Structure formats: structure tokens, C-alpha cells
């Protein structure tokens, strides 16, 4: 059971082996594949998987908030597993590009702010807005 | 891509979806400085001829509901819009009671500038909301 497949099972989504292959490809990918790469890797596994099935499945994984479709800085639609906790966002105000980041350091300070006011931190939303240097 | 206008930034603060029409309307509002709906609509249609006055009205109303815009009658009877005040404090929210605890953290702000810097950016704004339950 791949992470993406596990996510599908939680959503009560219909799964078949072709959808499982696509889920596995997305889960095993070291990069953030575009649809062409998902297709190439999925058909390398089972050549019966059509390009249409790949588009349909990735879109479904999007619509069920299992995958995020994201521009990592190349203007391409690339796919990533939607994380267990939301990534923080740094927005380029000149282009509207979103840089997703994680900061265990900021998280530690967030916990301290919650603790000092007598709270357990249960979540956060952080947006940063920047202009390119 | 597009420039993130000052009003679009307020939308992003709220986690609102930036549809093309909302982006255009946010940009027009940002470039205006107390338009009525007709002025917003005329300016929005200069950018996207297919935007309707209904869409403009509904969008400015939504922005008002989310405290992005304020609406006032300055005497001429027209509802006129302006950017709502924004908070200087970040918020810790007790989710059980829906109560706000204001805080400022120069420390966390220094870290935010460091993140921006590391990615090749100067920080021009931020919003932080923390969600908590009592210990």
C-alpha cells in the first residue's frame, strides 16, 4: 500500500490496479513528476495504462485533495503528495508563484508562543510575501 | 504569472481561491483608491470585457464579508469600497472558544526574513495564524 493509495482508501475512492500503479509511481518518484513522467513510469510498469487514464487519475487525485498540482519554478504542472501537515507558503508578489517551505525552527517558536499563553499548538497557517532580490 | 496586488494579498491572507475574475477585481480595487461598483465594473471590463456587473458586485460583497474591504456611503448614496484595516498583530486562536490572543514576535519575524533571504527574496509582508487548545 503506497502513501497515495492509503490516501485513496481513506477517501473511500474506487481503486483498481491501474489506479494503484499510478498511485505507486507518484509515491515512489524522487522528483515531482509532470503528467508525461507519470505516464512513462506507469506504462513502463503496465503497458495497458492509457495516457487518458493517467490524466483522469491525476485530476481525480487533485479533486480529492490527495495530490497537489504545483509550479516549482519551471512553469510546469508537477505533482506532489499532499503532506500530512500543510506546507508554509512564500509568495513571489511579482509573479504569484508559491514557494512551499518547511521551517522546524519557526515551528519551534510557534510552539513556544502557544505554550507561553497556556495553549497546545494544534495547527497554523503562515504566508510570507516577497519580492525577488 | 501576475503581480499580486495589495488586495489580492489580503485574499491570500484569508486562503481565498484566486480565480481569474477575482484577481482582476482585486487588481482594479488596488489601483483605484472609494470606487463604487460601477467604477470597479468599468475598470474590470477594460481588462476582461466578459466580466459582468453581477460578478463584480458579488465579488466586492464577498471581500466585504471576509473583512478584506469596507463599504461606506460618503453622502452621495453610493456604496463605496476601500481596503479594510489590517491587523498589526498576529493571532493565536483558541479554537474551542473562538477567542483571539494577539501577539507580536520580533523573533519569528527575524526568522521569516531569513527564509525569504534564503530563497532570494526581500519580505514585504506576512500573516501568521496559530490554532491552539488550552493546556
Residue numbers in the entry:
A (entry chain B): 2 to 134
B (entry chain A): -1 to 31, 33 to 134
Give sentences copied directly from the paper behind this entry:
Fur, which was first discovered in Escherichia coli, is a global transcriptional regulator that directly controls the transcription of over 90 genes involved in iron uptake, storage and metabolism. In this study, we present six crystal structures of apo-Fur, holo-Fur, Fur in complex with the Fe2+ transport protein (feoAB1) operator and the P. aeruginosa (or E. coli) Fur box.
The apo-MgFur structure was determined at 1.55 Å resolution. Each monomer exhibited a modular architecture, including an N-terminal DBD and C-terminal DD, connected by a flexible hinge formed by residues 83–88. Overall conformations of the two Fur monomers, especially in the hinge region, differed greatly, with an overall root mean squared deviation (r.m.s.d.) of 4.6 Å. However, their DD and DBD conformations were almost identical (r.m.s.d.=0.9 and 0.4 Å, respectively). No absorption peak of transition metal ions was found by X-ray absorption spectroscopy, suggesting that the metal ion-binding sites are not occupied in apo-Fur. In this study, we solved the first apo-Fur structure without transition metal ions and found that apo-MgFur is a transition metal ion-independent dimer, providing a structural basis for further studies of apo-Fur.
